[PDB]
Scaffold this active site. Structure first.
Site, PDB file in Angstrom:
ATOM      1  N   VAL A   1       0.102   4.354  -2.503  1.00 56.38           N
ATOM      2  CA  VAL A   1      -0.162   5.721  -2.066  1.00 56.38           C
ATOM      3  C   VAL A   1       0.774   6.700  -2.764  1.00 56.38           C
ATOM      4  O   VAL A   1       0.348   7.763  -3.230  1.00 56.38           O
ATOM      5  CB  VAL A   1      -0.051   5.818  -0.532  1.00 56.38           C
TER       6      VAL A   1
ATOM      7  N   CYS B   1       0.816  -1.208   0.000  1.00 56.34           N
ATOM      8  CA  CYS B   1       0.000   0.000   0.000  1.00 56.34           C
ATOM      9  C   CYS B   1       0.855   1.265   0.000  1.00 56.34           C
ATOM     10  O   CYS B   1       0.429   2.300  -0.533  1.00 56.34           O
ATOM     11  CB  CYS B   1      -0.975  -0.021   1.180  1.00 56.34           C
TER      12      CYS B   1
HETATM   13  S1  CLF Z   1       5.428  -2.786   5.819  1.00 54.69           S
HETATM   14 FE1  CLF Z   1      -0.290  -4.173   5.832  1.00 54.69          FE
HETATM   15  S2  CLF Z   1       0.314  -6.080   4.724  1.00 54.69           S
HETATM   16 FE2  CLF Z   1       1.341  -4.366   3.535  1.00 54.69          FE
HETATM   17  S3  CLF Z   1      -0.037  -4.049   1.755  1.00 54.69           S
HETATM   18 FE3  CLF Z   1      -0.685  -2.430   3.281  1.00 54.69          FE
HETATM   19  S4  CLF Z   1      -2.057  -3.470   4.729  1.00 54.69           S
HETATM   20 FE4  CLF Z   1      -1.274  -5.120   3.407  1.00 54.69          FE
HETATM   21 FE5  CLF Z   1       4.561  -3.235   7.878  1.00 54.69          FE
HETATM   22  S5  CLF Z   1       3.180  -1.451   8.206  1.00 54.69           S
HETATM   23 FE6  CLF Z   1       1.929  -3.111   7.244  1.00 54.69          FE
HETATM   24  S6  CLF Z   1       3.208  -4.974   7.468  1.00 54.69           S
HETATM   25 FE7  CLF Z   1       3.531  -3.989   5.462  1.00 54.69          FE
HETATM   26  S7  CLF Z   1       1.609  -2.532   4.991  1.00 54.69           S
HETATM   27 FE8  CLF Z   1       3.560  -1.523   5.953  1.00 54.69          FE
END
Ligand code: CLF
Ligand code: ICS
Ligand code: ICS
Ligand SMILES: [Fe+3]
Ligand SMILES: [Fe+3]
Lengths: 472, 522, 522, 470
Positions: B156, B152
């Protein structure tokens, strides 16, 4: 083993990389002989299948998640909170959904509207909904996932305003996964969040009746009960464990921690920041200890007791005398079954060095070890525990670990869930050294018994002689 | 303390008196915990219809969702192609979670890479990560193809996947002909199944879009089969088994069954089996394309109909008796192959099992959840069994799907007490099984915490969980099972009736109290 | 009373207060029942080692046996031949029980006739019953073959089956060319598996003994397979499956898989499939004959070796990893066919499952029972899994068998706490699971009463039953499962680990008491 | 569906037989003395559904007695196939004070066949006493070989019984005796008379009331006897005994003290009922608790034998359950109205359940018994419609061919019939075991019966038998 043979190994494995990756990875692999050996805490090279997680895993997964009477919001899209729900066995006592919430997944489930307009007013409405449906919660943390920082949201503003409105502790944590290079910066960010928003609450309160034997366990996340198996020993020694950070931890335990006399640090990597802070602001000293195996646990109990008076030092020797027949029976039973077996480890920021003594208490040898996200002070502490000419790997790639295992041929590998089924198919016994393979505790004398039977049950399991069909 | 001859793990170790006293002292001294009477009072309140009304008024807060994010589904789709590495452009924490989530369910290795986009890339984009990432992945893990999706953070910040890949090939980081299909998979739109649809449509376009002048519908005499997001090995196997039995030529497009079930024979195999690139190039030459899970393959449908010119049949997921019948008759019509005697017999053995077990199944009330196609197939089969699917929950469902399910319920007397919930989650469902208690839940492992909650109210209110769905983490090898076709329906039936009998046996096991009904023969 | 919208069956109807009061009134008024204190005291006594000592001193009394009588096995063997009617010469009450017994296990019709011998035939023999019985049976049910066994009445009075059958043909009741194989099957010798061996040997002699001069060993290039007493449809299916995978010509001698699994398609099929007469006639021309359950095919072994001149290989039941390997390698040697890649992979997938599940299986203690070959294969596999088969019970086992199992135990550390019992019954076993409590039982449905007993002592003393064996009456469609080969080992593995995990989930489901260990992931 | 049509159905089916079997079976098939023959030998090789005398004595009459230990005496087969097969429910602590679902056997080996099992029997009685001290009596149920080899279980019983001051009942119910379970009933009744019923003839300490009654011939299938007893005691009667369903040896011994014997199963228990009237003057009457019409009729008739206070309570019971069974009919009769049923059961229910089917608007178009006598068929004539099919000791062949022509909507029979008709596409309910459901007796049982007939007759599975491409 030969130092010559280990260095030739490293060269050969690196010959698959393009030049830029090869030159970087070369610096992260070394043969043991303080500092000037390996570098660490650097960015991961793209496309090489690092085993590392993100800062959110380091803040929500390891530091904040375990706090049992708070509600932790995975703030962003639905992903991070779901993959990390109940995946780490940070054990706790509570009535889940009523007064405790560790294994639940609270999230703001970002939709595109939230990416375009922002998520701050959703956060505010969500905090009100939490208050109505979970009235017994004693505080709320807001664990930022990747989009929160990129889109320009201000969770600090929402935290302050809603916190004053509801007289509630609401902790904003900017642990977005794009920050840092691993889970490591998540520890730091989370430490500073505790400092700025929770730890000072009772600075000016003196209701708590203190004793000269007040102590706090800093950096034990109670995996399979590890911290309970540590607390019982400390308190049999005459100490009073005011707090546990974060395993089975309550918010009030944390708020009470500035009143203790000594901070006992198990995981240095995740918690050294807050321990150094409490030494600056409150004068509380801190010390490192190790409760893996009888040798280290005994060493630690005596080192901790030396900080107090003769009465604690006497009770120390009583505890040591009590458990002596217990761990000596463990060694007598399991050491002959594991003597001389060789182990390779790959874990996170503490255990790749901390468990070595427990392996040596069963006559086993650690021929290789490495960390996902450790820093150079961790490797400094690792030079001493590891024997010379052993293999070290920082932020090992999936390719490298497989190639190292193929040449070295350990009898047992101890790593994570993403590694487990790889090496089981190669016919090498594997033990998960994060989740304890759904077993444990491994801390203390009671944990050593479980550790021993677990290493033996897997290393010597009959399934390992059956990998090759008798017709080939 | 431990006895070396009978070592205790956390359970039951911490029930020893000294641990129990120590835990009591910790709570009383330092936890400042609410009184037990207050905890009991709040718990009882959370079981009431008053609480449920408040629960269903939630607009901003989600609690215990029953869905994941898009790139998880993109990974699973990519895993089904031969010697392909799933590659998620963006931040690396995601890929650790993706691999672990599938590790835990399949108990197998799960290979996937990231290009580790960090703080700097938020300001200047992830172009260099893609250049070095594709080249490193290609050289290190030697895949024949790299299938790129997004986290994501990369969505973005607006990274142009198409341009970044084209520039990686222009600058010489990977060969121009090296296959690099791609799909934007934003976590904040849809769910994991949407990521599957997006990734598949991206792979389809990559191997087909600019080559259509060469194609003639039907010239290869096969039928394309698109499985969708699928986590039971038996479901891939049962489809290929039935089509082979009919003698139908087919191409299963995205087939991970081999990679998710390699033998432990002394060697790790990163890749195995899977749909070949050629099968993808040649798919427009099929007679037609069948979508096993149409309610999350909308984007794919528009591509195969709009570009391949296939007339995709209106078929439900082949679950239960009626829909497996309709699936096989549609395959028979398209291919000209008659349904063989072996499948007619298998159908009759499923019907035979239904007659043998119908008295224990009749009127049984179930709460269930999962993905939209799976849920409606389960709802259909439950009605065919004479069961009542009282609470039907699909967190990632939509309005048009709910209308379809509602019309399925209306066509049966056994749907009279059923309600379909979309956009609701497992904390909503917790309330429903308290206020309108069913006999069982059919769901994934997260359902275990609902069963625990119901048991805390009382044994007479406990709702046992029956594990069918994804993910299943606390039982072993259920991912080998089958839920499609007659084979899958026979498995579901057997699971359902025996869960009912096992619960009956538990409730009648009390000596001199309830064991008058502890029958040897059921 | 009843509420018309929620009708209660016996459970829980009789827990209503008015029934409860009525049942207490009945007991106090008229049952002259022992007081509850005395009942409790006697129960606790039956759980002690002092009671167990008196229990094991039994010589004359049997309580809850784990075996049946010879003609039950003869019926099952006869059912495995094409359009064959099993026919038990003797009294009709036996056939009613044989049919009902198999009815409840297979949930299928079970066709078998009697010649209804009565008081007057007990004084003058049942020759007229045989003459009219065979003629009525052939005319009414149109079998191609009638396979004759005996009831204990007919054995005691000494009816000469060969003479009666020959006289029936002499006097024109059935054609001289109509096949009427026979075997004496006395209920007071051996058990149900002895009747299978006797019935089979009788059928083999009927079709070959007269014809051996034109036979050449190996000339048809097949291997004969003799399954023995087998009540799992998957076990017939997996043997034919593996042999066809290898490309091995074979003949399954006695194959009831079709007759015990007809489809429900609007007609009843009395007969279906089965071993043809032509296959039995041609059987001496096979390369060799393999006995899948040698410990109850002694008589068949001696006939196959002494008359057909086949050198029957010394092979254990193909159960578990080692003995399935040996089965396939012997079949390869005899047939000259290589073991194909598909079976090598299947072996590897079973080993993979063993590595995935070994930490939950390790050290798990089991009490188990059944027939000799089945029991020793379960013992073998349990040792391969790192489990401890501490109580091994085989009511119909013999001394040489026990010797063989004891040697198997001595070859593994996991057998150091095991004891093999022969001639002991399920009341003996109830004592063992009280005094030397295991973690689970593996057995048939009669074991449900042992779990009830253990639970009455206390939840911490309950030993849950895992249903593997015959008969299984209280669950549906387990007769469809598999216990042989890699496929059966995978099924057993999965049942074992998940029974362990289901039990763990129950013991940790208590809120704020034991649910610190109620893990999502296991 | 026409006298003529049934007539020609019968001859058509009979054309398959050889002449001997044909002539016999024609006497056992009729369209309703002068109509049908019964209680004759089964023709060899025709797949009768009948059991044996041991089933009739051990399985049916003696086995349900819960505080006695019943020895299946002979080889291992009979006791094992009959273990916990009949749902004769009971309250007890199994293995310490109750023993119904256990299998006690002498497991005859060849040594016992050649030398006799009488010393083994005495040794096994000692072992029963050692390991099961709370048993209140032992019965010895003879399997086929006991009479054939010349054992004397009577002597062992009398000798050991006197040695241990214990009630030991020798029952010569060897399966070769008689023609069906029916003789097992008689043998079992006579064993009760000869060894149990008279124990307290000189005992005057039981406190009788004018309303003392006994339930004779209810084996508590699925709780049947419990759902009948509750009605009788709500009516003001005192049920001193239940034979054999949840019955105790002391209840049997107290039965000679009652004022009226209430016989449900006439076939199995009329013998002992006749005797008790002969010896103790206790009158007996038949009743029927299947369905609301028969239950109301039975309650009123039983109450009429007593006084006005009992008849007052009878009308109170009837008024109490009126809304409950009327709600059952309102819900389930429209779902079953006009549906046609064929039955084949043992010796009572083939006629006794007809009124319950009719209470739901269903029509019994065929019925028959395994082992009934002529007096059962006499009673059946009044219950069955005109021109309906009767079959005594039906063969498997006949039953299938009858169903193929009649095409009933539902069949009620036993376990050996169930899976045949299910495969043919015809809803089936077990009318022995209640298909693991019930009770079906009384008002509470009618609710379950109606629910069960509806769930199976109208199940969605029945419309799915034909493949859509077939
Ligand atoms: S580094 Fe979360 S798994 Fe991702 S694609 Fe967006 S929802 Fe799905 Fe760390 S904070 Fe989280 S786990 Fe990744 S998105 Fe970032
Ligand atoms: S916190 Fe750290 S990766 Fe110190 S992020 Fe990680 S429960 Fe590891 S080596 Mo998982 S620095 Fe703890 C750890 Fe060690 S989650 Fe646990 S096992 S002792
Ligand atoms: S005793 Fe008889 S065969 Fe009257 S032997 Fe049989 S529990 Fe039947 S029609 Mo099974 S004369 Fe009872 C009977 Fe009826 S076993 Fe039950 S159902 S009312
Ligand atoms: Fe695996
Ligand atoms: Fe069936």
């Amino acid at each position: 083993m030969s130092r010559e043979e280990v260095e030739s190994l490293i060269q050969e494995v690196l010959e698959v990389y393009p030049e830029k990756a090869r030159k970087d990875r070369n610096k992260h692999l070394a043969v043991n002989d303080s500092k000037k050996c390996i570098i660490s805490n650097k960015k991961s090279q793209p496309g090489l299948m690092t085993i590392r997680g993100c800062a959110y895993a380091g803040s929500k997964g390891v530091v904040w998640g375990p706090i049992k009477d708070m509600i932790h919001i995975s703030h962003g899209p639905v992903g991070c909170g779901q993959y990390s729900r109940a995946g780490r066995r940070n054990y706790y006592i509570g009535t889940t959904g009523v007064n405790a919430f560790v294994t639940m997944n609270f999230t703001s489930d970002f939709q595109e509207k939230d990416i375009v307009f922002g998520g701050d007013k959703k956060l505010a409405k969500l905090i009100d909904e939490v208050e109505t449906l979970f009235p017994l919660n004693k505080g709320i943390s807001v664990q930022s996932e990747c989009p929160i920082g990129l889109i320009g949201d201000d969770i600090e503003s929402v935290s302050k305003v809603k916190g004053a409105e509801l007289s509630k502790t609401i902790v904003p944590v900017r642990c977005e996964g794009f920050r840092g290079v691993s889970q490591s910066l998540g520890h730091h960010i989370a430490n500073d969040a505790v400092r700025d928003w929770v730890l000072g609450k009772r600075d000016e309160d003196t209701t708590f009746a203190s004793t000269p034997y007040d102590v706090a366990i800093i950096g034990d996340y109670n995996i399979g009960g590890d911290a309970w198996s540590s607390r019982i020993l400390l308190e049999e020694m005459g100490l009073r464990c005011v707090a546990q950070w974060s395993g089975d931890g309550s918010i009030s335990e944390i708020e009470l921690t500035p009143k203790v006399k000594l901070n006992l640090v198990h995981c240095y990597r995740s918690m050294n920041y807050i321990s150094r802070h409490m030494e600056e602001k409150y004068g509380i000293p801190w010390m490192e200890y190790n409760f893996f195996g009888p040798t280290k646990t005994i060493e630690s109990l005596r080192a901790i007791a030396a900080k107090f008076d003769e009465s604690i030092q006497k009770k120390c020797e009583e505890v040591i005398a009590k458990y002596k027949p217990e761990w000596e029976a463990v060694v007598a039973k399991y050491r002959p079954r594991l003597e001389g077996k060789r182990v390779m480890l790959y874990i996170g920021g503490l255990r790749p060095r901390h468990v070595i003594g427990a392996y040596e208490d069963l006559g086993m040898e650690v021929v290789g070890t490495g960390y996902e996200f450790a820093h150079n002070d961790d490797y400094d502490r690792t030079m001493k525990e590891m024997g010379d000419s052993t293999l070290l790997y920082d932020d090992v790639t999936g390719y490298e670990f497989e190639e190292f295992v193929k040449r070295i041929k350990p009898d047992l590998i101890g790593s994570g869930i993403k590694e487990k089924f790889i090496f089981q198919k190669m016919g090498i016994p594997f033990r998960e050294m994060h989740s304890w393979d759904y077993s444990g505790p491994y801390h203390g004398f009671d944990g050593f018994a479980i550790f021993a039977r677990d290493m033996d049950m897997t290393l010597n399991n009959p399934c390992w002689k059956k990998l090759q069909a008798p017709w080939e | 303390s431990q006895q070396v001859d009978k070592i205790k793990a956390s359970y039951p170790l911490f029930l020893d008196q000294d641990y129990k006293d120590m835990l009591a002292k910790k709570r009383d001294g330092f936890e400042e915990k609410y009184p037990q009477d207050k905890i009991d009072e709040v718990f009882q309140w959370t079981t009431t219809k008053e609480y449920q009304e408040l629960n269903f008024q939630r607009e901003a807060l989600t609690v215990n969702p029953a869905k994941a994010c898009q790139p998880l589904g993109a990974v699973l789709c990519a895993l089904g192609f031969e010697k392909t590495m799933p590659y998620v452009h963006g931040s690396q924490g995601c890929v650790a979670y993706f691999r672990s989530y599938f590790n835990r369910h399949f108990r197998e290795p799960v290979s996937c890479v990231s290009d580790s986009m960090t703080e700097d890339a938020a300001v200047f984009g992830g172009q260099q990560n893609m250049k070095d990432g594709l080249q490193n992945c290609k050289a290190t893990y030697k895949p024949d193809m790299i299938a790129v999706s997004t986290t994501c953070m990369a969505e973005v910040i607006g990274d142009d996947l198409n341009a970044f890949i084209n520039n990686s090939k222009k600058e010489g980081f990977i060969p121009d002909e090296f296959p690099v299909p791609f799909a934007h998979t934003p976590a904040f739109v849809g769910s994991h199944v949407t990521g599957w649809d997006n990734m598949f449509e991206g792979i389809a376009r990559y191997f087909t879009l600019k080559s259509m002048d060469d194609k003639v519908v039907g010239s290869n005499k096969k039928i394309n089969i698109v499985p969708g997001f699928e986590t039971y090995l038996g479901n891939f196997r049962v489809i290929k088994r039935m089509l082979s039995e009919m003698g139908v030529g087919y191409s299963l497009l995205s087939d991970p069954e081999e990679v998710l079930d390699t033998p432990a024979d002394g060697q790790f195999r990163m890749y195995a089996g899977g749909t070949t690139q050629e099968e993808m190039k040649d798919a427009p030459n099929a007679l037609n394309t069948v979508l096993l899970q149409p309610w999350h393959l909308e984007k794919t449908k528009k591509f195969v109909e709009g570009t391949w010119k296939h007339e995709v049949p209106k078929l439900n997921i082949p679950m239960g008796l009626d829909w497996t019948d309709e699936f096989l008759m549609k395959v028979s019509e398209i291919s000209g192959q008659p349904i063989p005697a072996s499948l007619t017999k298998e159908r009759g053995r499923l019907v035979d099992m239904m007659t043998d077990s119908h008295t224990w199944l009749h009127g049984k009330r179930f709460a269930l959840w999962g993905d939209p196609d799976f849920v409606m197939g389960l709802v259909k089969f439950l009605l065919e069994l004479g069961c009542e699917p009282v609470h039907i929950l699909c967190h990632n469902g939509n309005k048009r799907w709910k209308k379809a399910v509602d019309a399925i319920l209306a066509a049966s007397p056994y749907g009279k007490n059923a309600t379909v919930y979309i956009g609701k989650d497992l904390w909503h469902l917790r309330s429903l099984v308290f206020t309108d208690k069913p006999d069982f839940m059919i769901g994934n492992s997260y359902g275990k915490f609902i069963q625990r909650d119901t048991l805390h109210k009382g044994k007479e209110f406990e709702v046992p969980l029956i594990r069918i769905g994804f993910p299943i983490f606390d039982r072993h090898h259920l991912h080998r099972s089958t839920t499609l076709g007659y084979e899958g329906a026979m498995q579901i039936l057997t699971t359902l009736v025996n869960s009912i009998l096992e619960r009956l046996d538990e409730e009648t096991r009390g000596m001199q109290a309830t064991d008058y009904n502890h029958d040897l023969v059921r």
